[PDB]
Amino acid sequence: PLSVFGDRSTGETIRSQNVMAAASIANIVKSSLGPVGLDKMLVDDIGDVTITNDGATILKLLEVEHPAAKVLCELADLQDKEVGDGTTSVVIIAAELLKNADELVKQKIHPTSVISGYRLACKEAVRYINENLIVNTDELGRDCLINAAKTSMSSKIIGINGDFFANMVVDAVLAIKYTDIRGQPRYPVNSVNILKAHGRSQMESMLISGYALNCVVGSQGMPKRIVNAKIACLDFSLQKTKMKLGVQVVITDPEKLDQIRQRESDITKERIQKILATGANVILTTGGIDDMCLKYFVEAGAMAVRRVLKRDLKRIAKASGATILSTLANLEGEETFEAAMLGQAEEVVQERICDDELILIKNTKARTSASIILRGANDFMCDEMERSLHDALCVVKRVLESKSVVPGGGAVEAALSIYLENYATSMGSREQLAIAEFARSLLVIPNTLAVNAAQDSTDLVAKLRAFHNEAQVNPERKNLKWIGLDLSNGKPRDNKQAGVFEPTIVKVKSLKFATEAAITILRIDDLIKLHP
Amino acid sequence: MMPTPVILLKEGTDSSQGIPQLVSNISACQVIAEAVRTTLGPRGMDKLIVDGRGKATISNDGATILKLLDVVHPAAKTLVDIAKSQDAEVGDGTTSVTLLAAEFLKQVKPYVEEGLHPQIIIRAFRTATQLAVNKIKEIAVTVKKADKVEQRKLLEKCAMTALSSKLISQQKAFFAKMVVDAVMMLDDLLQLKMIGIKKVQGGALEDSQLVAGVAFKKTFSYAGFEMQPKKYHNPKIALLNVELELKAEKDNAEIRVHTVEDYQAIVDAEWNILYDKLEKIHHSGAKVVLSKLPIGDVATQYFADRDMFCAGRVPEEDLKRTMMACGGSIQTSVNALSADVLGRCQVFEETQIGGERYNFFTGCPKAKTCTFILRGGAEQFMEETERSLHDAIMIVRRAIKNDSVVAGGGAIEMELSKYLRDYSRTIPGKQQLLIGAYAKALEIIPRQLCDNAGFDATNILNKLRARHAQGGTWYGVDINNEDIADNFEAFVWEPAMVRINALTAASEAACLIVSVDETIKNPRSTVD
Amino acid sequence: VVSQYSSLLSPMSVNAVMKVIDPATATSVDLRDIKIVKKLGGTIDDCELVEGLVLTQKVSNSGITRVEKAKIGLIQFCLSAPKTDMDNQIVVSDYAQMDRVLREERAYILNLVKQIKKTGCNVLLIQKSILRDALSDLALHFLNKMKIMVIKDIEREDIEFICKTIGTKPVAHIDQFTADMLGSAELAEEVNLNGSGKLLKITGCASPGKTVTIVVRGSNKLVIEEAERSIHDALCVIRCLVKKRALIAGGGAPEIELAL
Amino acid sequence: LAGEGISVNTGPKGVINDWRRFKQLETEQREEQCREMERLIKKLSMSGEGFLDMIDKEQKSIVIMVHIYEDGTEAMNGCMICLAAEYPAVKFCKVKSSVIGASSQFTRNALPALLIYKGGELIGNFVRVTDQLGDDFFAVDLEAFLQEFGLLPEVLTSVRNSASEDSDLEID
Amino acid sequence: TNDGATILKQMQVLHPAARMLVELSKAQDIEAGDGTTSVVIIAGSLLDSCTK
């Protein structure tokens, strides 16, 4: 009757398929949650091997066919983009919410009522988190940042070495700190150039008090160490001059060909002479440099680096005070290069790192910059350290920007579950079931942590819920709001005292994104799949 | 895992172990329960299944639907097995057992996913089932008066309740009275083979009748049969197992003669043997002759000459029913055809029923058998009517064995769930969650009733829970009134043993499914 | 699906329709004057009703953002080496000519940039060009030294909307580029959407035009598309109120009354 | 036997589902047939879906060559591996003839196939290269032979360098 | 999507009557903007009555 060239699913079938797909995506990454979680290996069809614990990377690398699974994968990607941490918790929470909402729907509860209940529960959870479970970081000091970094690097390849990696992360983030208009301290992460090089152990990873380039000097005749570096940043190639498309050379008097050919290279020669005449020592360009210009730099005893990355060049110019010049043209139609466009550094060296060389611009002036050189056993290990390091940097940035943190280890989830199951009795008649299911779904995080720890999940979560219920009922027991999970010993523990923190924005964004994804999937009750 | 040139098991062996395989087993059980989910209750609907040969089976019976389903999942087969067990021991509740088991598994699935040890769940199921069975036995209503009228009414009400879910539910009182009447005439053992069920195409349901005797189809009459009278007013019936026709005396017999006089003597001797058997039958005084073995045309004409009715090739079960109704004895030899070995009925007659000829033996005062003659517009119609009447007959037989009844419509399960929740509120707490899950899963049947009827399940569930909590034992789902009502006063009655067996089988299936941790599938041999 | 965010979306739709048409003496609403911008990220609660215009194009003049008291200028000519419509070649037969070629090219580019700057313009929009380079690196450097925001690759079909929103009159030749053809605006800033892309917002314009822009945010693309469709439905409903201003009850009442 | 004007009418629109399914299957076989016909007869005289959608995809500005083989194939495979190590920008790959299901003549007399694709068209169809190349020539010989026709395209980091758009801003 | 016009035009219907209903929904969207599902349901019910 429809005569539609495709398959159709309607009613319970499509809802069950969507929930099964979401649950499968959840179960894919449920084994990499919490410090007792374990990494996974992803192998391509060409033999490429990837070892990672990050949920977003795992979901990006996998091939996904079902649209709901695609929704969850893009939810994880969005959570990574907007926050940088919690990319697994958001997926798990969204899948659990979808499962509980589908169970409610199978109980003949209309999906609109469930959606309204989920919206109310999300709003009240955000409000309760912002009003009760936040901890101000002003009175905690640098220990708060250290603990946040250590918590973020748990369940990662650099977990046990956290005592050192957290110091590195905090130092780098504080080094790249700057202030903008209206006095907001902004921390531009991704300005920390993360360099990888296998070899010696992790503890030999170096935090550079400057910048690091993954490139070497163009010529072997140039010195590989300059003390008082006058860095000149350029955005144009230094090679033989060639006329543009609209300019053509036509010779009628043969005596002028030699002069033409000489001028052709003398133009670049005089440009290099103008650049060197101001005392420049290090010359970095995004374009290439041919042989004669390299020799010109060699004879002057000055560095010259070609094919420098644009972002690296911009960072070097910003840190050292230099300005990038795409051309040597002033405001009076001449070629010139003043000393004002020269950045300065305390030292520029080409260091050797495991049979390979890289350039270290050390201790730039007028601005502090940082870079990290990661040393690992092999390439996969270095990649995983880089991913974990980026996650830690993002967490520290979130903590420094917004000065509120919340206890970790499922304490927030248990407190929210207790508060929501108490609050659901206050409003509505059919939405109360939805809010109760939201509270129950919020408990998937501590349960997953306990399961990963191979502990008694039921008893441990029951004890956590009892502690939080006592905290919420007794007004003189507010100190129990911080009772999290001690995964090493499998017992409840005051996580705020133990130093297990995480940014409030992580939880807020995870809750909002998971609620929106569950709502989006829940509206679907009919599928049409046209044949290709 | 490494290729390991020499391998342990046979190549192609599939193994699944851990929590995920248990979760998959639970999901398969839910899938099986969904296939018979909508067939429960007066508002239930039938299912049609087509086999490879193209035959279609229409049935509301859970056991039949599960049998026609070609399940291959090892965990899913347990639900079909327990449905078969419930059909065998009870005959009703085959849809309820699968739903109960699947709901148990669904309720305990979240605890399984979080690492709960299966043995705890098994122990909780055993304890809850024991308590529920004890409660059912305690609160079941029985009347220790042995009054014929009230016991008959109880049988009829149980039959109507067991019948008020099929396509014959419109005439449920009529068929219930027929079934109770048929069962009451069985002697001591209530053997199912003593209740003949004949299906005749054409005619309405109300045209179906119960015969106080035996009736069977006409069986390939020979020539000269139409010359026999087809009605007798006090016949004597000769129940025989004899081949009455000219034939070789023995398969290995050989006749050797060397004279034409001996040849004529031999042919006359064969004819005289046949005529002597027929003469003995005739002077036995019988007017109706029935035989397992064929009755030849010569014997048919001989009996027509004497104004008797004959019928050969009668099926064995039909002759057994005729013997038990008229009160004779099946004879392999006709030499001693005494008076006591002859059946007797008040009226014998051959009548046409929907394009078929049937022989009727009515008026038997001491008959111990019956004969259902079912009418309908299609063969599947008669098949489903026979299945429904079989369910009713089994229920009536069980009620005869013990008249212990509980109210239906989910009232018994509300009482059990309330009792189990009250018990679970008084234990440490590890078993409390599992017993509470069991009590919650006990609510599946009334919820399914409401869903099938098109109600709002949540409101009816809340009303039933509130009614049972503050007092009231037999309050269940009232389909017609869109509300709840006291089902015991509404005569929605169920034998207690039905629910006892249902709970026991569901609990055993759930425990067996949970107790399995690994599944191994050896590669198929001789695939052909 | 935006029934939950209705409390924010419906006033936004009403304001969007009212700000684009004259409440009196109006018989129709041109919905193409209400631009919808779909940006991934955030939630539906992050939808905005910016009064000016938002351009997805990035700023070529990196290092300068958030121009205040902007004098926006929209040009349709190219800031590159001279090139006539006729095919043209520059023949050099002497080294002095070869040097004078690029000397005069630099002088011409500097003259163009100085002429642009002298009008007081500080934000420049350049129409997309496919024949010749619209904005050369030399011109970009000259504009950067004079502290002018440069925005190239402006779509041809967007010229009318931009001119209506800001009031800039398009310029196709430097001779007619004068201060009276610039569109004064309160502020023009490029804003980052929490690391999920960059948007350029021009909010606050002297003598604002009759155009509005709605920014739609969401967790995933599907809900963004559905939110856009629902907002379009709301705008169409308000348009249906604009012409044939008659209202009836919903809820199936008209259908049952018609049946009776 | 009349009514030549059948005018099937409602038929095609009432059974359009099966007709369109068969059309889709036939077209799916059609792309494979068109791809395989570019080799047979055209040059022979003088999973398959993976190959099809690998040829369909990727940029037209990158030269991609494929090799057809059956189990001196090993020497040419080694030379191809050496060229891949020498030309990372290229995406050397090989596929069995039986997977493609080519003609029997190609299998029996055209085992060494050097098929080069550039933007969906055959810029080179070197087939049975035994005679004009040899049996044990090294990778450099193959590189020179292929570069003589102008078909093949003309430092080392430590391990890796690659990893919001806010690069770095010190502005107050 | 919940929009009737989008649902109708997003799936190929292969039947002339269904295609004309899709065009009807598109026209209703052009003129009014909403009610695209209601007009199609009205047309379907009208043809249902036309059968009897």
Ligand SMILES: Nc1ncnc2c1ncn2[C@@H]1O[C@H](COP(=O)(O)OP(=O)(O)O)[C@@H](O)[C@H]1O
């Ligand atoms: N030392 C710790 N003790 C207890 N819980 C922790 C500890 N470190 C992290 N957690 C908790 O483990 C959970 C899982 O974090 P993880 O999965 O590693 O982050 P992501 O979700 O970004 O991958 C977090 O919610 C955090 O609260």
Ligand SMILES: Nc1ncnc2c1ncn2[C@@H]1O[C@H](COP(=O)(O)OP(=O)(O)O)[C@@H](O)[C@H]1O
């Ligand atoms: N008149 C009635 N009102 C409400 N419920 C009824 C009524 N009659 C039967 N039921 C319910 O129907 C169920 C039996 O359904 P049915 O499919 O016939 O057999 P099974 O027990 O195999 O499911 C019983 O649990 C009983 O509670």
Ligand SMILES: Nc1ncnc2c1ncn2[C@@H]1O[C@H](COP(=O)(O)OP(=O)(O)O)[C@@H](O)[C@H]1O
């Ligand atoms: N709150 C409400 N209560 C009752 N009916 C409503 C309500 N909101 C919308 N409706 C009805 O739902 C019908 C469908 O509207 P909608 O789905 O938005 O677009 P379409 O008319 O294209 O389906 C409308 O005719 C309207 O009368």
Ligand SMILES: [Mg+2]
């Ligand atoms: Mg983390």
Ligand SMILES: [Mg+2]
């Ligand atoms: Mg029954």
Ligand SMILES: [Mg+2]
């Ligand atoms: Mg509408």
